[PDB]
């Protein structure tokens, strides 16, 4: 591979696949545009006003929010799938393996990219037109109060790495090509691709983050934290399954089935 050409190809594809980039999100979050400010959502009244001002649905806040997260997740799975197809070699893999890689990869990827939309105090919503506070999300009734908080905890640590979109494009590709997913039929060709992606990621980080020479190592070690969030999320979903008499979008059910 030409590792610089690969990195560029992945960045261009990431830009085509994901309409809200970390670059745009950071501009919005630091107020460095290009306004006006996003509408801030911190209580039920401001959530309701936000729906007016402006854009089955529960009239209960916790479920309304949970439903919004589902809809956005369904969109994210489609974007991620488009992106996966652009990774060299991916569409030549066994189709059962392609499905396996997406099934087990999407949570890791979603939560990695969600950090781009977060600062310590809240998260951009609705394509950046709104900003939903972390404390508001924490205040939701049980069991939903703990729905977002682990994502924020991860995000604060992960955002400390100061990755940009060009870094993230390669890291997300590395996540997709994970040869250790349960059920993979041909592990070798997945690892051959991941090996090239890791090389590209390493060079990219070395060149563009000269002050932190071991950022690559630091980034690879975030997988435990990321997988921990996913585990806590699946556990919460089980509690929600028992407690809520709740409907899950078919694509999400499909992902969770035998996960």
């Amino acid at each position: 591979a030409d590792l610089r050409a690969l990195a560029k190809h992945l960045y261009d594809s990431y830009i085509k696949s994901f309409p809200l980039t970390k670059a745009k999100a950071r501009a919005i979050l630091t107020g460095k545009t290009t306004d006006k400010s996003p509408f801030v959502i911190y209580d039920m009244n401001s959530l309701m006003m936000g729906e007016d001002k402006i854009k089955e649905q529960s009239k209960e806040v916790a479920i309304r929010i949970f439903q919004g997260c589902q809809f956005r997740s369904v969109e994210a799975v489609q974007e991620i799938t488009e992106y996966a197809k652009s990774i060299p070699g991916f569409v030549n893999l066994d189709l059962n393996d392609q499905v396996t890689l997406l099934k087990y990869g999407v949570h890791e990827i979603i939560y990695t990219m969600l950090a781009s939309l977060m600062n310590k105090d809240g998260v951009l919503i609705s394509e950046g037109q709104g900003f939903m506070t972390r404390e508001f999300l924490k205040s939701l009734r049980k069991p939903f109060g703990d729905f977002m908080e682990p994502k924020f905890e991860f995000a604060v640590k992960f955002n400390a790495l100061e990755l940009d979109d060009s870094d993230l494009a390669i890291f997300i590709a590395v996540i997709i090509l994970s040869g250790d997913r349960p059920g993979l039929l041909n592990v070798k060709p997945i690892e051959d691709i991941q090996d090239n992606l890791l090389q590209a990621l390493e060079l990219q980080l070395k060149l563009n983050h000269p002050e932190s020479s071991q950022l690559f190592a630091k980034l690879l070690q975030k997988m435990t934290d990321l997988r921990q969030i996913v585990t806590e999320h699946v556990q919460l979903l089980q509690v929600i399954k028992k407690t809520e008499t709740m409907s899950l979008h078919p694509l999400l059910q499909e992902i969770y089935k035998d996960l």
Binding site: Q78, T81, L95, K103, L251, E254
Partner: peptide, 11 residues
């Protein structure tokens, strides 16, 4: 087979 929607997205 067990993942109808994901399969369609992929092809």
């Amino acid at each position: 087979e067990r993942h109808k929607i994901l399969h369609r997205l992929l092809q």
